[PDB]
Amino acid sequence: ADTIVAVELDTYPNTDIGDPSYPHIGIDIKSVRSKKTAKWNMQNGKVGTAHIIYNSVDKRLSAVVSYPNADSATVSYDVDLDNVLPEWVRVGLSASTGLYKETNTILSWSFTSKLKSNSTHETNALHFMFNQFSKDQKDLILQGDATTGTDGNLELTRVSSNGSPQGSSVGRALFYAPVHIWESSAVVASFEATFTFLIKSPDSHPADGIAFFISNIDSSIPSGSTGRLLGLFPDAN
Amino acid sequence: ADTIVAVELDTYPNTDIGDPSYPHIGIDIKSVRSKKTAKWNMQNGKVGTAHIIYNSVDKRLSAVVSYPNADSATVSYDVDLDNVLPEWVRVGLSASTGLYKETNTILSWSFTSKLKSNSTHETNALHFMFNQFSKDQKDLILQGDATTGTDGNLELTRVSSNGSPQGSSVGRALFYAPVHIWESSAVVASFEATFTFLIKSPDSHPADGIAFFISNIDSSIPSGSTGRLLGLFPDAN
Amino acid sequence: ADTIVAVELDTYPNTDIGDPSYPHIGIDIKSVRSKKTAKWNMQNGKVGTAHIIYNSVDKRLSAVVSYPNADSATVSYDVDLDNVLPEWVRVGLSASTGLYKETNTILSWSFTSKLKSNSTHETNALHFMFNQFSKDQKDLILQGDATTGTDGNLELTRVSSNGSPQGSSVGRALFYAPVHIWESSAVVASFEATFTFLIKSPDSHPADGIAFFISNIDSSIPSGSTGRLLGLFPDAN
Amino acid sequence: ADTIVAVELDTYPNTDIGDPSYPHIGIDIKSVRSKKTAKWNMQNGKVGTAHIIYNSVDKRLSAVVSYPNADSATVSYDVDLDNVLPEWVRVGLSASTGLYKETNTILSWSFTSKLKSNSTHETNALHFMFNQFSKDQKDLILQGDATTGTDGNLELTRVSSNGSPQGSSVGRALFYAPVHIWESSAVVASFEATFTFLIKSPDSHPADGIAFFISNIDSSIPSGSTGRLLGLFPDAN
Numbered sequence: 046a047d048t049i050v051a052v053e054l055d056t057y058p059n060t061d062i063g064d065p066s067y068p069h070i071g072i073d074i075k076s077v078r079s080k081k082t083a084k085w086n087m088q089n090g091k092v093g094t095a096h097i098i099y100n101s102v103d104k105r106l107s108a109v110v111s112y113p114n115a116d117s118a119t120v121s122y123d124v125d126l127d128n129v130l131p132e133w134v135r136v137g138l139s140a141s142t143g144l145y146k147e148t149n150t151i152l153s154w155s156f157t158s159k160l161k162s163n164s165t166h167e168t169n170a171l172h173f174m175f176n177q178f179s180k181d182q183k184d185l186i187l188q189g190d191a192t193t194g195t196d197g198n199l200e201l202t203r204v205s206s207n208g209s210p211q212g213s214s215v216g217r218a219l220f221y222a223p224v225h226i227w228e229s230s231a232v233v234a235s236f237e238a239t240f241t242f243l244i245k246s247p248d249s250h251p252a253d254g255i256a257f258f259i260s261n262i263d264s265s266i267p268s269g270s271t272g273r274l275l276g277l278f279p280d281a282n
Numbered sequence: 283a284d285t286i287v288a289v290e291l292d293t294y295p296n297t298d299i300g301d302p303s304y305p306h307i308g309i310d311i312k313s314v315r316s317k318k319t320a321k322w323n324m325q326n327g328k329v330g331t332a333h334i335i336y337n338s339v340d341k342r343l344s345a346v347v348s349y350p351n352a353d354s355a356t357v358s359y360d361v362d363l364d365n366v367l368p369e370w371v372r373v374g375l376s377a378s379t380g381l382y383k384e385t386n387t388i389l390s391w392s393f394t395s396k397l398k399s400n401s402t403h404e405t406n407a408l409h410f411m412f413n414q415f416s417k418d419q420k421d422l423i424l425q426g427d428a429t430t431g432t433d434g435n436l437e438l439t440r441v442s443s444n445g446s447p448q449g450s451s452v453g454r455a456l457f458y459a460p461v462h463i464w465e466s467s468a469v470v471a472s473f474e475a476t477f478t479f480l481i482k483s484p485d486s487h488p489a490d491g492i493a494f495f496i497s498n499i500d501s502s503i504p505s506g507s508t509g510r511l512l513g514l515f516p517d518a519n
Numbered sequence: 520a521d522t523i524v525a526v527e528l529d530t531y532p533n534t535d536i537g538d539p540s541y542p543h544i545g546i547d548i549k550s551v552r553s554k555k556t557a558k559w560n561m562q563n564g565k566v567g568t569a570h571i572i573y574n575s576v577d578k579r580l581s582a583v584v585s586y587p588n589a590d591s592a593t594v595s596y597d598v599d600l601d602n603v604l605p606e607w608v609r610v611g612l613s614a615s616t617g618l619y620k621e622t623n624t625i626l627s628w629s630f631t632s633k634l635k636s637n638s639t640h641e642t643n644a645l646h647f648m649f650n651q652f653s654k655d656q657k658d659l660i661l662q663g664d665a666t667t668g669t670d671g672n673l674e675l676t677r678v679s680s681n682g683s684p685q686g687s688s689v690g691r692a693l694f695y696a697p698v699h700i701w702e703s704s705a706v707v708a709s710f711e712a713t714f715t716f717l718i719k720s721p722d723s724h725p726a727d728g729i730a731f732f733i734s735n736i737d738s739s740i741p742s743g744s745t746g747r748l749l750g751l752f753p754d755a756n
Numbered sequence: 757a758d759t760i761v762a763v764e765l766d767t768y769p770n771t772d773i774g775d776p777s778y779p780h781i782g783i784d785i786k787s788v789r790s791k792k793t794a795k796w797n798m799q800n801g802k803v804g805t806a807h808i809i810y811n812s813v814d815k816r817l818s819a820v821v822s823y824p825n826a827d828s829a830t831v832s833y834d835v836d837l838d839n840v841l842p843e844w845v846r847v848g849l850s851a852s853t854g855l856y857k858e859t860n861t862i863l864s865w866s867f868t869s870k871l872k873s874n875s876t877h878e879t880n881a882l883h884f885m886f887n888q889f890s891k892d893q894k895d896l897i898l899q900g901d902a903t904t905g906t907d908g909n910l911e912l913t914r915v916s917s918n919g920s921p922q923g924s925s926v927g928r929a930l931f932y933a934p935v936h937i938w939e940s941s942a943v944v945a946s947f948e949a950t951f952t953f954l955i956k957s958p959d960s961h962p963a964d965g966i967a968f969f970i971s972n973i974d975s976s977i978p979s980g981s982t983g984r985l986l987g988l989f990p991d992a993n
């Protein structure tokens with residue numbers, strides 16, 4: 046049903062569904078089994094930053110994840126998103142926990158989309174930036190366990206009062222307005238997304254991860270997508 | 283019911299509801315009877331540009347309207363919008379015709395809103411720019427007779443096949459996402475809107491005008507607001 | 520010689536040249552004796568943020584200074600900068616120490632200038648943002664004791680190896696490119712500047728302050744402007 | 757001496773130095789003999805738009821050129837600019853005429869550069885946009901025959917009073933401030949340039965072309981680079 050293109054920051058190695066044996070960042074085109082992955086030296090309790098970029102001329106989705114004072118992890122995949130997504134999509138962040146858990150806190154999120162047409166100066170653009178989230182963020186569609194305002198952050202999965210992450214949680218937050226990613230007279234379409242996150246677990250094996258995703262506008266959390274499916278896919282195919 | 287703050291480009295002098303005897307630009311705070319107006323040397327058939335700016339430190343809503351090769355018209359009004367509007371609003375463009383008519387074509391529209399909080403670097407922003415409108419613009423809520431895609435323009439009021447404007451028409455287009463204009467820890471909130479329009483009438487007395495407005499998110503066209511009420515107000519009080 | 524318009528964050532009350540008896544923020548139009556001031560509850564050792572805005576329609580220069588978890592200080596002054604500055608100016612940050620001292624560290628600085636002409640879509644813009652400063656920042660003109668790269672920050676006045684601020688220091692940093700602030704067919708000109716700073720003194724009476732300023736392009740530090748003159752004015756008239 | 761990376765809009769086929777037999781767009785890395793070209797259906801007397809993009813993660817320089825109501829031409833080349841250019845560069849536009857000629861008019865030019873560091877939220881950016889050029893554009897370095905203000909346009913090569921293009925002309929315009937394109941803790945560096953141009957010749961064989969280029973900051977026009985060398989290269993090697 047949903048068409049999902051996602052960049053996952055997967056904290057738990059589910060080697061049985063194709064994950065590598067370490068935290069990794071991957072590019073998922075309609076399947077949790079990433080088309081490409083790169084080792085990610087995930088840092089528990091540290092604030093990281095993910096940058097995702099794409100443009101219709103190169104047709105390459107690339108992502109860079111970094112932590113202050115550390116070397117970055119980057120992954121890229123050649124894919125023509127016009128062939129995968131609808132021309133109107135919603136963008137969001139998703140995260141889950143399963144038997145293992147972690148906080149999936151988002152501290153800021155910005156996104157810029159641009160469609161440059163062939164008429165001179167005909168640029169259509171959408172840009173949003175959230176460096177703080179209020180309890181009543183009317184421009185975000187929160188699905189599942191996702192909540193805003195707790196310390197001005199967006200908590201994608203359930204965290205109990207004493208800051209503790211809860212297992213079997215799944216939450217997503219999508220920007221309210223549809224995003225136009227293809228248009229017939231557009232000569233170049235591009236987007237850039239950036240978000241900082243804080244993944245913290247009391248456990249030595251945090252799970253499951255955070256994913257920036259683009260989907261059909263009506264996307265909703267698939268039943269049973271807690272844990273390894275990142276609140277994005279119905280199954281592991 | 284609706285709370286409306288609007289900058290009107292009024293093409294027809296309804297001297298009986300307080301308009302001056304000439305085309306004028308005015309600032310309307312909850313009433314069609316503008317709190318302030320300025321003479322506008324409206325140019326039939328020429329593309330104009332309106333710029334509207336406001337920031338919560340100065341609490342002054344200002345608008346400048348110009349035509350290429352001509353002198354601008356500007357109007358400003360001191361008003362604290364925190365005291366008039368809700369903290370979440372929708373922004374839009376509205377226009378109408380009555381017994382007299384004109385095309386109320388919008389060729390481009392950009393808007394930028396910013397809320398700078400007191401935490402270091404905590405900026406929340408929303409920016410959209412439309413330099414072309416497609417027939418299925420999913421990020422715009424079109425109300426009344428407003429349509430998009432005709433020559434990539436947004437036609438706020440009805441235009442028949444042979445380019446002719448129709449009387450008694452009213453249409454509005456609002457950006458889909460709510461806009462956050464006040465937040466408790468914001469030290470400065472500001473917005474800037476710009477739109478180019480083309481008002482053309484076969485008649486010597488075009489009517490009724492175009493208005494950039496900000497309203498409660500659920501605003502809808504008031505019954506009977508064609509003509510002098512600009513699709514914004516229920517009556518002329 | 521130099522034409523200076525500056526927003527000062529004055530940490531030391533020189534009541535003899537008109538300062539009030541407390542830290543204050545003020546708007547200086549060609550004189551160190553501010554045209555308007557507001558009490559500033561300056562916080563030693565804390566990172567603050569200053570926002571400065573202005574547009575040619577309202578002709579009001581306004582500034583807001585804040586510290587996380589604290590109430591802001593704001594000051595505004597009605598002034599038509601077209602009547603004070605040249606149409607091409609350089610923008611910068613200046614700071615000084617005298618007998619009393621403090622570190623005048625700048626951690627980030629962004630500036631946006633826009634000139635919207637009367638031709639449809641004719642916007643001229645300049646935007647720079649520095650969230651990190653490198654030792655060889657070729658796009659900044661550093662004058663006096665100002666240095667960059669120390670912890671990626673810009674140190675406007677001299678700081679010795681052990682982090683200690685030195686007295687009788689004065690330094691300014693200007694963006695390399697001239698900024699066009701007036702143009703004959705411009706219907707609205709506006710600018711916005713933001714910078715975060717960290718003023719820290721071992722002493723109970725820090726001095727002298729930091730100032731965001733706009734000047735003729737060839738401005739240089741006036742002789743003897745350490746201390747109370749903020750590296751901006753030749754004398755206290 | 758100069759390090760030049762340029763995207764050329766070559767109007768004249770100098771098949772002897774490797775041009776194809778038609779107008780073409782090409783990517784030049786330190787040589788006029790393009791590393792990659794694409795046929796360009798150049799339209800004499802029509803305003804076109806060129807878009808150039810690049811980011812350090814993909815290391816692909818791509819350009820798209822279009823005319824209203826026509827299909828675009830696009831060319832891309834895989835190149836790591838960190839390995840070719842200095843970390844501080846100047847960006848510009850260059851053009852020339854030789855025995856054959858054409859007007860090389862620039863109507864608008866925007867450029868955005870971004871360097872995202874590994875510290876959370878550490879973005880350094882530079883953005884300029886010129887939609888009009890004044891006779892005294894102090895933020896542009898004009899070299900050779902380039903002049904500004906004629907109809908608010910930038911004329912890269914000599915045009916006589918009666919609008920006629922002159923042969924053997926060469927002119928370049930560079931943005932005044934150095935641009936920082938690489939920095940040691942940057943996880944992603946990217947730029948985007950856009951410019952609209954109007955190439956008009958009374959002749960059936962216009963020459964020579966327009967080029968968007970990036971170079972060492974001190975670049976100057978090489979002697980003898982009129983005609984086929986586009987005011988960029990000293991020779992045709």
Ligand SMILES: [Ca+2]
Binds near residue numbers: 057058059064273
């Ligand atoms: Ca996994």
Ligand SMILES: [Ca+2]
Binds near residue numbers: 293294295301490
């Ligand atoms: Ca009226």
Ligand SMILES: [Ca+2]
Binds near residue numbers: 530531533727
């Ligand atoms: Ca003082």
Ligand SMILES: [Ca+2]
Binds near residue numbers: 766767769770965984
């Ligand atoms: Ca050639």
Ligand SMILES: [Mn+2]
Binds near residue numbers: 053055064065069071
């Ligand atoms: Mn995985």
Ligand SMILES: [Mn+2]
Binds near residue numbers: 302306314316
């Ligand atoms: Mn009126």
Ligand SMILES: [Mn+2]
Binds near residue numbers: 527529539543
């Ligand atoms: Mn003072």
Ligand SMILES: [Mn+2]
Binds near residue numbers: 780
């Ligand atoms: Mn060539």
